[model samples]
Target: KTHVQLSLPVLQVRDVLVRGFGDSVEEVLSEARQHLKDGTCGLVEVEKGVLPQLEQPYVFIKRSDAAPHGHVMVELVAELEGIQYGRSGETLGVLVPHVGEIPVAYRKVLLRK
Candidate 1:
């Protein structure tokens, strides 16, 4: 699979990918952490129906695989209409395995405007 290389804000603490923007980086990161800790981070396994929307754009969520997860903006990439998936750097490619492999299907993430 072709890698989807992207460069964005300073985020992605461990398994978490801070989805929202606009506020201070530290402040936003703090909230993202809270979302994960409190189990309100719009997880793929937990919040199955709230992901991969054309209107909402991207989100932050959790998964279980070689890589952690991200708030992947599937709207820009991917061609899946019925199911959800991601690629190398994002779109469910958070695991970042030592020798990364194909995209894994799992839960998605929190919504961003």
Candidate 2:
């Protein structure tokens, strides 16, 4: 997050579109949120006449669940450190906004596009 304070925090129970559900849900927990979470989109606050996208994009660190290496997660933590340092900030487009929070936009080309 770079500890960026884009906005002050509030604890309101918002109907913000959720994304992290590769593990958890009901019929309400659907695929679109997954799409938002899995690098295709993310949450950001938009300003009038300004574009919006993810400040911190997704990395589909799908290296070794099936492969199963104990050292892998450790490798990934540092790997992510490098990834964040190496990755650039940009996107393909800023599509029209929907209600509540909206997505920003990649992968190593999975963490960006």
Candidate 3:
């Protein structure tokens, strides 16, 4: 398990991980695609390999409804004033290649380990 610390639009991300749940990476990708279509894992604010200057909001899409059955994990990043951040005066939303929609709420930091 790899641990990363980051701050989002509001809260700080303490840690996140990815695990396979009997499904292959292809399956996870398919589900993620469906999530993109159904507004599950909406938009990718920052593509992998690109880093932002300031703290950004994001979610680690643990492909599971409950623990112990989680599958893949995808990190969604965003700017604080971006569409998903719920700022006062912004439009057009963030950008991503695969997932082509905006998310509603930005996840925040809750605890430290």
Candidate 4:
């Protein structure tokens, strides 16, 4: 089969507060490595659900495909009174191919205030 390569949008995290996670940045990363090692098993998977209402927005998690080894992508959206609004969260078009490959720093665009 012929394969095609395509450029994907990258989500860069400039700042992260790991207060309760670890004492130092390196420590935080080290701890996170253990979690990511297990991959999507630690994450909650949602096939579909009604978007909830809240003062802050939320992320609706879903897999791009049904493969056991596939990418996990998060959708950032808002809904109030059963209506949806806004675009996909910034820097989230990119996918983490495996749970083990998940990045230590993740986007919190929905938490933006």
**Best model per lDDT:** 1
| Tens digit per residue, CA lDDT, model 1, 20-113 | 3224334433454444434343322213433432122233332222321453433222222343333323344221111122222434333221
lDDT of 4 by residue, 1-113 (tens): 12111222222222111112233334433443333333321222222331121122222222222222233333323333445444543333212222233344332211111
Model 4 TM-score, all chains together? 0.22
User: How far in Å is the alpha carbon of 89 misplaced in model 1?
Assistant: 2.7
Off by over 4 Å in 4: 1-19, 39-113
Q: On residues 1-113, what C-alpha lDDT tens digit does candidate 3 reach at each position?
A: 33223222211111111211113334444453444444333222334433242223332332111122222222322233343321222221222222222334443221111
Which regions of candidate 2 deviate over 4 angstroms?
1-15, 24-39, 43-100, 103-113
Screening candidate 4 with a backbone cut-off below 3 angstroms (N, C-alpha, C), the clashing residue pairs are 39-99
- Candidates in order have lDDT scores of 0.30, 0.24, 0.28, 0.28
In order, what is each prediction's RMSD in angstroms?
13.9, 15.1, 15.3, 13.8
Which residue ranges in model 1 land beyond 4 Å of their true spot? 1-22, 43-88, 93-113
Write one digit per residue (lDDT tens) for candidate 2, span 1-113: 21111211111113234422232122112332344334333332234532222212222222222112221210011112234322223332221112445322211112211
RMSD of 3: 15.3
lDDT of 4: 0.28
Q: Please estimate how well model 1 matches the true structure, expressed as its whole-model Cα lDDT.
A: 0.30
Stretch of 10 with least lDDT, candidate 1: 94-103
Model 3 residue runs over 4 Å out of place are 1-22, 42-113
